[PDB]
Design a protein around this ligand. Structure first.
Ligand SMILES: Cc1cn([C@H]2C[C@H](O)[C@@H](COP(=O)(O)OP(=O)(O)O[C@H]3O[C@@H](C)[C@H](O)[C@@H](O)[C@H]3O)O2)c(=O)[nH]c1=O
Ligand SMILES: Cc1cn([C@H]2C[C@H](O)[C@@H](COP(=O)(O)OP(=O)(O)O[C@H]3O[C@@H](C)[C@H](O)[C@@H](O)[C@H]3O)O2)c(=O)[nH]c1=O
Ligand SMILES: Cc1cn([C@H]2C[C@H](O)[C@@H](COP(=O)(O)OP(=O)(O)Oc3ccccc3)O2)c(=O)[nH]c1=O
Ligand SMILES: Cc1cn([C@H]2C[C@H](O)[C@@H](COP(=O)(O)OP(=O)(O)Oc3ccccc3)O2)c(=O)[nH]c1=O
Lengths: 446, 446
């Protein structure tokens, strides 16, 4: 039984869902209320605690790594990075050490899809996570990892029905804070009469697109999985042909010389471990801290950033076809040297001790951009199972003038980014968030 | 200036070249003679020497790694691998230590293409490499690395003309013997009047296809680059749709728990360092040795295998469409856990101390297969800059009965493998060699 290589293309179904905002379950206006209601019904709150009051976590003796005594969950370890300028790397030279999150296991982030009245809906979960700054955001249907093996609906993803897979791909998490970690992003259709429990809501993609314009609503794991949806390209031209884009990126992945090693947390230079936080000696980057989730239900470390981040794509129409200016970013926690990232991705406080000329390219342009050139803006936060209130302004900004890309940057269409999300290690988490925001703004312009 | 995303497709030109065996430069029958002649004109031979007589290599003091004093070239270091069976890995459990080759630099393997009388030719180089068992084989137009910076024609690849790129992709080298190394495989067209020096010959792809049937002729780097050629699929159906194949492989990349670390060579257990070789205590796997290339022109380490290898694809026609049975192989030197590999890939001596039931799946079937089911057979050798006479029987064998793939295996069409070679870390070096052999047998059946 062979089938066409392109069998069961879901692009028309996806497009229909993106165009529809009347969902079977709730009108969109209500969802904030439903969220507000689950936001309100949520019993759990979170308090900062000293490391010593962690239960079942400890700084293990020889490495000083922060680990769970069961071996489950993640660890905080050390990382040393050097980017060489030498005989075989373009540089410039960079060298540092930092804590890093490690968890050498792939988790499942799965969204279940099902047709109602001829239109696909997606089963979103109102989920409390301790680092969400507003506690409850909307997560994938299933968010689970095998070292924890009961999760509702995990049977639809472990293994998925091969006949019903829309998306199934490994995608990397933040390159600055995790060491080489990816999760399996999945979207799978069912025709089954699935149960519906209070924390779940069926939404069309058009409803999700409206919600994607809201601050701190569609959570980071959901935006990563939704960014992988395979829409049909409406304008199948680009400045680089797809071959030229892969050649450009090949050169970017080849031209650096970056050497990374994992080291004991106790060995990390430049960071100070106190009774309540581990922090950089000059107050940059991030802090590791500890929280209790409340009797106490559990305790765990979290990572918090030192400020609000800025993450933006500059957009230009080239012969009528919008392109975004990607950067082939080199981060210490990437598996394969570079990943494509947004035009600007940074926490501005980390550059504030430097002269303006050492700031990331385009940061000033983005920070000064007028409302009249801002095509999309919202504040989103990062995975609340690992990060405490890590927030950034996510922007899409029309560039008023043509820009000759600097080394490391290139004009790419959003459709080329969507195509690359069939594979791992091409599009980084922040760029996947902006791709989902671009797709949302295209489906349901505000 | 935007262009179609599919602009400048070379598939028709490639197909024309594959169908043509009358090349502009030499009829094929002669090339052995030309090779024989360059084989004969070659002055250099190779002698085994004690490690102590290496010039400019040494076992560096603290690590005992074998390194070139200039910092150029590669190193021999140690590797420790554990595959866990535990809470988050399917296993089975494996643990070992071994020497490994490291060179954290991407080299260029480039084939230059040019039309003569309306047909693309490719400029192959008769190149002596010290580990080639017959000294001279045919290499890409340009084989070079930036830590060595004069190489003829390197200007066509550094950087390539974006308007003339046929292939440009990073592909991994052997996972058992190199630590996470890939090289940039490139095919680039020119219309320039290129010089022609005695070590170079223009060949059509049909001529290369005939030569690919010869033992020890088209060298390993050439077969890797040629395997990346993007032919049009003649039968665009398969047992797995392309999405299903990527889902299957995603699960394979997710389901193992393999932890690898680089360690000092001096720390490797189970291997003995003598005055002339480093070897496994039970005579399995490989040896590290040293050679002089001859006054002495240079000296270097080489790795030699303990026996002739066996590398084979089993083939079945499924509804008329031939598929090969790939394995998602876990090797210690892979960057991303698994790569697709041939149905059988092993050195049989490494299993010979074990009962037949512990042998790799299908090895017995392949070793016993009749001539009447062998669709392709040749002996090829591995990169002669790093390996001394490492040879394997490469086979394509028609499977007489249907096979329900065991865990880790799946039926994939050669066209699906060709498509995946646009990206890194999908198709391993031995499978890329067999893909080039399959394409050769299809173009110019013997
Ligand atoms: C963590 C750290 C970084 N560095 C160097 C490494 C980088 O060149 C530079 C910037 O560090 P980064 O962690 O890349 O931060 P950044 O400000 O450039 O980028 C950040 O953007 C935010 C939007 C994301 O939410 C963050 O996850 C992070 O990616 O500082 C140190 O010197 N010491 C350190 O301890
Ligand atoms: C090197 C080594 C391997 N092993 C284990 C690891 C693997 O499970 C098993 C087989 O080792 P491998 O290196 O994978 O060899 P193999 O015989 O399975 O595979 C070989 O096939 C040949 C065709 C290729 O040319 C080789 O490069 C290699 O891939 O032995 C050790 O226990 N100790 C060692 O020192
Ligand atoms: C840290 C931690 C968690 N939990 C509880 C709290 C929560 O009920 C539960 C699961 O926590 P987790 O594995 O963090 O997050 P996901 O479920 O999102 O799993 C995925 C992990 C990675 C990729 C995808 C999913 O364990 C604890 O009880 N103690 C701890 O220290
Ligand atoms: C080991 C070695 C080599 N050479 C000389 C011998 C030869 O003339 C020259 C280049 O040797 P090399 O870098 O090994 O192989 P390529 O040119 O194929 O480079 C690529 C490397 C990796 C990927 C692609 C290409 O240096 C030495 O002089 N001493 C040595 O120890």
């Amino acid at each position: 039984a062979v089938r066409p290589r392109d069998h069961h293309d879901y692009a028309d179904r996806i497009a229909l869902s993106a165009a529809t905002t009347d969902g079977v379950q709730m009108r969109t206006e209500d969802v904030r209320a439903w969220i507000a209601e689950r936001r309100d019904a949520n019993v759990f709150h979170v308090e900062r605690i000293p490391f010593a009051d962690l239960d079942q976590w400890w700084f293990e003796g020889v490495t000083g790594n922060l680990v769970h005594r069961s071996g489950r969950f993640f660890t905080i370890e050390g990382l040393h990075v050097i980017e060489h300028d030498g005989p075989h790397g373009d540089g410039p030279y960079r060298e540092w050490q930092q804590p890093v999150i490690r968890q050498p296991e792939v988790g499942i982030l799965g969204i279940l899809a099902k047709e109602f009245d001829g239109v696909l809906h997606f089963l979103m979960q109102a989920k409390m996570e301790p680092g969400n700054p507003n506690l409850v955001q909307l997560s994938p249907t299933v968010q689970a990892t095998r070292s924890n093996y009961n999760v509702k609906l995990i049977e639809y993803f472990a293994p998925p029905d091969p006949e019903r897979v829309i998306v199934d791909v490994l995608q990397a998490e933040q390159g600055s804070w995790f060491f080489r970690k990816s999760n399996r992003n999945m979207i799978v259709e069912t025709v089954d009469d699935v149960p519906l429990w209070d924390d779940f809501c069926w939404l069309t993609l058009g409803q999700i697109a409206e919600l994607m314009h809201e601050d701190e609503t569609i959570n980071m794991n959901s935006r990563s999985v939704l960014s992988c949806l395979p829409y049909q390209d409406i304008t199948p031209r680009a400045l680089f042909s797809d071959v030229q884009l892969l050649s450009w990126f090949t050169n970017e992945r080849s031209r650096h010389d970056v050497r990374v090693r994992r080291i004991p947390l106790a060995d990390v230079c430049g960071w100070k471990q106190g009774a309540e936080e581990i922090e950089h000696e000059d107050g940059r980057y991030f802090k590791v801290l500890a929280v209790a989730v409340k009797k106490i239900s559990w305790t765990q470390p979290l990572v918090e950033s030192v400020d609000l981040g800025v993450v933006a794509f500059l957009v230009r129409k080239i012969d009528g076809v919008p392109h975004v200016l990607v950067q082939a970013r080199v981060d210490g926690g990437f598996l394969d040297t570079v990943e494509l990232a947004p035009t600007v991705q940074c926490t501005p406080l980390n550059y504030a001790h430097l002269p303006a000329e050492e700031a990331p390219p385009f940061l000033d342009l983005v920070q000064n951009a007028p409302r009249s050139r801002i095509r999309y803006e919202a504040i989103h936060s990062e995975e609340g199972g690992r990060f405490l209130g890590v927030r950034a302004r996510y922007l899409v900004i029309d560039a008023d003038e043509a820009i000759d890309p600097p080394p490391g940057y290139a004009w790419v269409t959003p459709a080329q980014l969507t195509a690359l999300t069939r594979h791992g290690h091409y599009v980084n988490v922040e760029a996947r968030t902006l791709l989902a925001c671009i797709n949302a703004a295209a489906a349901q312009p505000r």
